[PDB]
């Protein structure tokens, strides 16, 4: 048969091929050219401090044993041969649970060119960890990393490199953005050496710069707590004889601030420090509590009666102070 040539070529390739040994074992170092094609940067879990990424993680090394002279130059094959040959043991250093997909068959690419160059890509779902600092939450920006290197082979055994320019060796796809909270600002790669218990390893790093959006947070925590300060500020304009009404104002607005304080601290890590959102909740709660203390003070002095000097001074003092605080805050963080 005509196909018998192309199966006498492959059986010639995998004849005496010891796949437990890297190519050029006692002679040189296995230079592995690597690039990443991010088909979809998945959603970022703030509570778990991790992120999800779908990739077409590529590799390209050089094997002298896989050398052939056939009718075809490139020898595009299925994954079966990828289990029969030496492939690098690239694991993800900060990965937590990565899925090598296999629907409907195993999603792997293997291309042996004539000289002996290999190309071996795969579709992965790396759920990498991302250490996040949330002192300016929710106007914070993170550089979520992605570190990968060989597990067993040291720096004198397997080194890594980018196949293209390092600015163009991580290509995020155009339509791939499953991010709802963040937006992917840009790319950053680096190559370094890490020191461990067994030896030195060449580690490859991929930083993804994400800036958080506050639109949802404006709807959920900021503008409810801006209106709640204004809602308790209505009580300054009433009578001095409306004691049940103004207690309803004070109690309802303090309860609203309290439930927004509790409901603000959700879907979030239980961090020890106080975020930038907490220093808005605290000052808003201080304003509404000061309004309630002002009502208690004017009620203790209430005995026809006359308009209160405390109320008339508070009607000017409270909105200007709230505006100064809002201006200072929304320039401290937003325009940082």
């Amino acid at each position: 048969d005509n196909t018998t040539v192309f199966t006498r070529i492959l059986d010639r390739l995998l004849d005496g091929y010891d796949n437990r040994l890297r190519p050029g074992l006692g002679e040189r170092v296995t230079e592995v050219k690597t690039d990443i094609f991010v088909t979809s940067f998945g959603p970022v879990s703030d509570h778990d401090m991790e992120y999800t990424i779908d990739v077409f993680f590529r590799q390209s090394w050089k094997d002298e044993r896989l050398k052939f002279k056939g009718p075809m130059t490139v020898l595009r094959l299925n994954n079966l041969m990828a289990s029969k040959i030496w492939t690098p043991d690239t694991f993800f250093h900060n990965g937590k649970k990565s899925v090598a997909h296999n629907m409907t068959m195993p999603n792997k690419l293997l291309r042996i060119t004539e000289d002996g160059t290999l190309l071996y890509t795969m579709r992965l779902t790396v759920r990498a960890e991302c250490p996040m600092h949330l002192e300016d939450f929710p106007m914070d920006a993170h550089a979520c990393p992605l570190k990968f290197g060989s597990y067993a082979y040291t720096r004198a055994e397997v080194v890594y490199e980018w196949t293209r320019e390092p600015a163009r060796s991580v290509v995020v796809a155009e339509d791939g953005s499953r991010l709802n909270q963040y937006d992917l600002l840009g790319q950053t790669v680096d190559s370094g050496i890490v020191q461990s218990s067994t030896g030195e390893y060449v580690v490859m790093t991929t930083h993804f710069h994400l800036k958080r959006k506050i639109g949802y947070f404006v709807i959920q925590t900021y503008l409810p707590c801006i209106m709640t300060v204004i809602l308790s500020q209505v009580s300054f304009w009433l009578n001095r004889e409306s004691v049940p009404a103004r207690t309803v104002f004070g109690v309802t607005t303090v309860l609203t601030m309290t439930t927004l304080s509790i409901s603000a601290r959700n879907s979030l890590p239980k961090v020890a420090y106080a975020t930038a959102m907490d220093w808005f909740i605290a000052v808003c709660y201080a304003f509404v509590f000061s309004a309630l203390i002002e009502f208690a003070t004017v009620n203790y002095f209430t005995k026809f009666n006359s308009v209160s000097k405390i109320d008339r001074l508070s009607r000017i003092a409270f909105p200007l102070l709230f505006g100064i605080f809002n201006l200072v805050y929304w320039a401290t963080y937003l325009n940082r």
Epitope: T117, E161, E165, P166
Partner: antibody, heavy 116, light 105 residues
Framework: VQLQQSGAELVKPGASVKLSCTAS????????MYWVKQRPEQGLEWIGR????????KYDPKFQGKATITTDTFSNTAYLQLSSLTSEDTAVYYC???????????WGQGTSVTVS | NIVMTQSPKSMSMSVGERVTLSCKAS??????VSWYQQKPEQSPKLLIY???NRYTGVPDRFTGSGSATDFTLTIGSVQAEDLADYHC????????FGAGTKLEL
């Protein structure tokens, strides 16, 4: 592990000059070939970059059109062309292979072109 | 692309003391710089790759330092055979170069 170039060239301005460098001891397909321009007593300026495996050449945004870089397969050699050379094109050229961590490891021997 | 503003253009000391080079990147280049020396009638030779990696055949006195943006090259106890120009390169993008730095006695 050696880069061998051609000799010097004496051409009139407005003409075209053919210049090339040959790499021996290693195949040029796995590495990247570079080109750099050294005008005398100033810094280095990069000309362009090829790769013989793929063939998509790419140049400096202030050097396209007037300068192109080509290569072949059998002779393991990288060629280039200049178009409409001027007085500021009088310089010495080197070609450099890609090393570890993209370092421009092994350079040429120097080809100085002069105009008249 | 990436603009390199290595300083100074020329600086001179005697034989046998510390000298510190500097190179500044316009944008982010992450530990991908390269230091070359320019001997007269000679092509550039690789000295330091990455950010701080001594190439084979480089003496121990040649030591570079690296960061995201600013890079320095330090030579301890320079002598007569190191009297050459020094160039700063990069490879995080398409490769560019600096101006250079002359050394004198």
């Amino acid at each position: 592990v050696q880069l061998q170039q051609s000799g010097a060239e004496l051409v009139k301005p407005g003409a075209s000059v053919k210049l090339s460098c040959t790499a021996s001891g290693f195949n040029i397909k796995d590495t990247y070939m570079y080109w750099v321009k050294q005008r005398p007593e100033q810094g280095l300026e990069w000309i362009g970059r090829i790769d013989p495996a793929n063939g998509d050449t790419k140049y400096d945004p202030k050097f396209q059109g007037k300068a192109t870089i080509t290569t072949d397969t059998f002779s393991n050699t990288a060629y280039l062309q200049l178009s409409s050379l001027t007085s500021e094109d009088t310089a010495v050229y080197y070609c450099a292979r890609k090393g570890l961590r993209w370092a421009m490891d092994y350079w040429g021997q120097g080809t100085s072109v002069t105009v008249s | 692309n990436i603009v390199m503003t290595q300083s100074p253009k020329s600086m001179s000391m005697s034989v046998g003391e510390r000298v510190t080079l500097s190179c500044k990147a316009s944008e982010y280049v992450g530990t991908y710089v390269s230091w070359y020396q320019q001997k007269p009638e000679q092509s550039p030779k690789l000295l330091i790759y990455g950010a701080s990696n001594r190439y084979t055949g480089v003496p121990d006195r040649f030591t570079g330092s690296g960061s995201a943006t600013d890079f320095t090259l330090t030579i301890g106890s320079v002598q007569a055979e190191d009297l050459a120009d020094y160039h700063c390169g990069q490879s995080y993008s398409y490769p560019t170069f600096g101006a250079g730095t002359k050394l004198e006695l």
